[PDB]
Design a protein around this nucleic acid. Sequence first.
DNA 1: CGAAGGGTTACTTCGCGAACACATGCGAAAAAAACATTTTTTTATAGTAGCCGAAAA
Length: 84
Amino acid sequence: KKVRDGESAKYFIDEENFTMAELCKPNFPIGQISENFEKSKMAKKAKLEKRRHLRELRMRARQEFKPLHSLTKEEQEEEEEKRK
DNA sequence: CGAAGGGTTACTTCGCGAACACATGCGAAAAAAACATTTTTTTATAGTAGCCGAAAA
């Protein structure tokens, strides 16, 4: 739902939320948060896009059968982006 | 009669003090040399960076 202190110390906290049981260790949103929204949200996104970037590098490296020349082809593509 | 050898007074620039108590060798280019890294041969061992599948809705 949103960030709100539902309950604690009595049962599974449910005042304004979508939780219905205890042992919330799995995903660990439980009560509410009011600290570091966007700078901590856009960190796993950056990590995930860099991992997909390295995976598509590993996929492109199958075609050109030269590893370090594929790395120089990558930096040649990014300096084509630089001249763009 | 005129150029030259001391001889001094005159203008300018450099050395000290101001009470008497109280309680607050240094820096910077390089150069011979004693020296470690860095290996690769495993290799026992835990896990810690990073990677997809069987599980739930």
